[PDB]
Amino acid sequence: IRSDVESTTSSDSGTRRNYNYRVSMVKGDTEMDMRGRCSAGQKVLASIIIRLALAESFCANCGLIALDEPTTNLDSDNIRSLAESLHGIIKARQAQGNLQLIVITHDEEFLKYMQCSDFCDDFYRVKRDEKQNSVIVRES
Amino acid sequence: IRSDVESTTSSDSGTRRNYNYRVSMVKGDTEMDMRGRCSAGQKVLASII
Amino acid sequence: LQLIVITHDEEFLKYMQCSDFCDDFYRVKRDEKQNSVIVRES
Amino acid sequence: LAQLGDDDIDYAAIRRLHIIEEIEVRQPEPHGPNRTREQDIADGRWDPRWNGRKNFKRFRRQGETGVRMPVQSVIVPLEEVRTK
């Protein structure tokens, strides 16, 4: 997560202090930007890590993160590649003992990867009843 | 397209003009933030129009 | 109206071609020298 | 009672403007009513090596209603094994 301290146009009677923020990638010497030049799967994994990493820096006490449909808009190869990716994070944070991760997905395929690991005791669900009022159930 | 013309804050002696924009979808009287749906077709269509 | 659309979806492109309101679609292809070229097809 | 739409086109002209091309009619062939062994061999359906091989197939071709070959299966029941 790179930044520019000197992003302020000199003002005679105004501090006008705005610091530029621009995240970039590195492969060997090259440091080309990721807005483009990368596949869809690369971004979705990127965002999750930043939200993860960023949280602990400010607080370092609460491991609460809430992904939303992270697997949406992904081709077949990436979703499983994404699935194993999340698997590494939780195992890494598992030793730390501080991570309360909430993830929402409506793709039948993606969900089974995490529960198959069997570390999560159960998964919830949301349904529409005869009166179209949301209901919550617990399933193992 | 609901441009907020009241977003402008009142400075001690100045107007400080600034308008805040957010595009919304209308179903009858109700109006929703239009963000968070999964109808990618609707998203692309609305952007186009 | 002079809308321009870019797509490589056989479905999406065939719909408009069969619509009969598109005279033709152009193409971009990588020749033996890996250089882009445009060839017109109807 | 019927709905009439005036499109102002001569249907009689349309009928004579239509072009009709003759299409040849092919002669009929048997639909494999009861093909003999030599017929299949001549057609290359049957391999002479298959002759004398035991067949458990319960299949019957159409037109073979009179001839029926019976198939009897002695079902062997399974036993749960004392798993170590």
Add this chain to the structure above:
Amino acid sequence: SKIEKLSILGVRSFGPHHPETIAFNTPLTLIVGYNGSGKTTVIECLKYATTGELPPNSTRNGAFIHDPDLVGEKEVRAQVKLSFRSTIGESYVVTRNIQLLVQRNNKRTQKTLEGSLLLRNNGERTVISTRVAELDKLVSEKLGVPPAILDAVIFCHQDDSLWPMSEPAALKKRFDEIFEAQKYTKVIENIRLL
């Protein structure tokens, strides 16, 4: 640093006559639902439970309350509950309440109601406070996190899940909130009144 259990009532699609509850299990808690089944509503309530701020441009028109027409009663009461364990071993529970009235007119007025924070001490219950402005401050301190982060990081809206990968200036804007940079910039502006 942990959150224990949640309970919704009369929010968006969720019914107003029967509370719905969901409990979070360390480390992962999963939520799957068919398209347009109110999967995202759970997150919104979790946000409003902690930071006490309604979704964006949604506080008008009662966009965050089970629409009164569906139930059929001109008056609708919405409730949100949150149970959690403080940074210290103690654990509290939070509540908030919203009310919405339908007048003779199509127009409807959103009214904020009293909430509270309860102490679930061993075999004892005590009331910490009842003023939401304070409860906003209380809740943040108990969680051990400041309000800025939850606004743009911890509870991210569905569409903008990729905010770190957005337009760079749009990427810039958020950090200004995340750093809580604005409080101190206007302290400098107070030095401009000087």
Add this chain to the structure above:
Amino acid sequence: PAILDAVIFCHQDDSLWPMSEPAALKKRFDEIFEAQKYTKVIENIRLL
């Protein structure tokens, strides 16, 4: 030129800037309107 830059010849994934998020959506209209340049004439004459 502001319309040329923002609306007409839109960038590929930026094609949905009408559905970029509110604050980015706001950064984009303020450009198209040619409004920022006349905010500058106001603030100059205010210093007057």
Add this chain to the structure above:
Amino acid sequence: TAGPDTIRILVSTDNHVGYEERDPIRKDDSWRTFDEIMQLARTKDVDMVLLGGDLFHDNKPSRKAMYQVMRSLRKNCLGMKPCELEFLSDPAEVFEGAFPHVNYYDPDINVSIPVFSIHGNHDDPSGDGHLCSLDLLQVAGLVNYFGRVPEADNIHVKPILLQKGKTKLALYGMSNVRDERIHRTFRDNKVRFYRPSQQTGDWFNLLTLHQNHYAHTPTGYLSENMLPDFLDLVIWGHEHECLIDPKKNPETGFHVMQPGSSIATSLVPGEAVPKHIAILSITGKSFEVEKIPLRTVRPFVIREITLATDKRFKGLEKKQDNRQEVTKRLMQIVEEMIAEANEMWRSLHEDSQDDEDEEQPLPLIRLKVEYSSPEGTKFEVENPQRFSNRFAGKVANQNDVVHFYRKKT
């Protein structure tokens, strides 16, 4: 009439298998009706079954949608009964080169009741290989695919020549095209048909097409009169309305048969007439139709009521604050329809071997309302969603029952 010189044909269309595949209460109305048509085919000893089109509702049917269609065909189209039809048409011209022979001419499959079809709008060619869902069935050997139109510009239509005894049949196929594209081709006279010439006559001609009959747009509908005069009977395959009774068009000289769907996709007056499939018996130059109603179809009733001119509570709802009473009238309107709907179902299944075993379904109701009123007056309209919700357990389409609207002028 069944005889050695008579050919019996079954007619069905717009079966739309898969429609509402995931509604909790209406998931199995899509195919169970279809599974009943074939069961009719085997029971009624029909020679061959001709599907109007739109066999599958979705371009890429899910496994469940496909699986039940293949199961029903396999059970009710394979047997030891020998086919009584002769295929005189050249196999290569109409069919794929992978399996040029007709399915029941195959040596490895004992086909009993050949089934013919033409792809529909919801089942148009697509994908890499220009494959339509039917194509998967045809390779499996269960469905004969014909009437395919490879080039949209030069439309070439070759009939399939069938003969049973002395009865000679010609089957002209013309599959789905963009509605107004077919309007234009016929106008240009580019289209052509290829007549049989072995007799240069004495050939019955049957045509099946899946285009709209009447539309507001002048080009959308394929005008009836544009067809040639040598045809005898035509299978209009798109209009979901049912008018199984054939009618002789005066100017042309042929009868027109419009079957109608097997399921009601859109709750409109058209799809309210009871559903039927026809038994088309052909002998010589003569034909006869024996309409067979479907038993498993979901019941359905639709009523059109305009509040302003409604006799019931015509002026009683004019008083101020009419919201509790407005619903009160309607509750009596719907309950009559519910009773009427449950009456029809009983009539059809009054006597049957499995009448006791079968259970009554939940009838579908739709009440379209116009509530325009003079400016000095107004009627309160309740929430459409709640209004229907009160019928939970009484109507399958719980989410919607009424559709309020005001005419725009």
Add this chain to the structure above:
Amino acid sequence: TAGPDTIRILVSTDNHVGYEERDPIRKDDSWRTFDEIMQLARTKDVDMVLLGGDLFHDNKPSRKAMYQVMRSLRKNCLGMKPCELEFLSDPAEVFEGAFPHVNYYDPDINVSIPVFSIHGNHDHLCSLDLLQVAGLVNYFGRVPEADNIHVKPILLQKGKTKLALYGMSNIHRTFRDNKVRFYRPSQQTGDWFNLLTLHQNHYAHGYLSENMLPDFLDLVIWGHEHECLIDPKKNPETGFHVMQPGSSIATSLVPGEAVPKHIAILSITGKSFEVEKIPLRTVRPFVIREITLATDKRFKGLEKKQDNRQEVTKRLMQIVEEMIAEANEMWRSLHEDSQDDEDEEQPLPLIRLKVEYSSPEGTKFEVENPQRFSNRFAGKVANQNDVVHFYRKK
């Protein structure tokens, strides 16, 4: 061996039909190989073909993926040939209710070579089922639940020979608990040959250990593993031989896929069996090697003390190009016969070069863009997107 008692089985696996058929060059790679498998089935006069599983790459196969698999089966599986296999297990126990009877017992579809497969995927209905309803492929190996493991062998007989075909489709905890229970015929016991094919679950987290299985089996087949090891081996602890059929098309470019691919003909007589491997011709040629830049003698590190960008490309050309030299020759060696009567065209071979550019110290090897490097071989390699992957040891 080909007699009245010998039973010939053609074993395959991981045919991953539909794999990357979007690409223009490799679209015909997947299903064409499958066709060659069945073409061998009819030509070699087999009695049944045993698919290791994963018959389809995508849980929702595209139409064109299915259309060509069904076309291939119909031409080759259905024929006048008699079947010498006698079915002894009750149909109800190990078949779905729609058509419990094995396909070739059907009174309406003659089957020359029955096809036995393992379950493909779960989304009740699986991808394969669409085939079973048509009767083309028989089914088995389905398991109801992870906790409730019950394996029902399918007993088949030909003359004197007796065959038992256990099916265990698709977690590691259950096996250790010993919940799994095997049904083994105790009548005429000891004269039943035993064959176990198992396709390790894709989504488990953890693989079956050879020591977990019982000791009465004779031969076993591992499906998921893609590297080809066709000749069987015996594990001294277990006491039975194991065979690894290996995939049919290189799904992931790695060292394992390098080894040539074969499908075996598992001949069985009495309690003993013999196996012979048939090389698969149509498979796309594939060559791979890894080169460490620092250690490479050929380079002798002329880049370490100097600039590199200009000549680095020059260096790899000689390495990549010679790989293609043996890429075609081995294809040519296998295509010497028939004088290229069919498929005379020479397919573009697949090449993957694994280079590590670790620098000892004070050295900066220049690395070119992967895509730009790859596309330089357009017309010589099918995988123009990537021909070399550059990585630094961590």
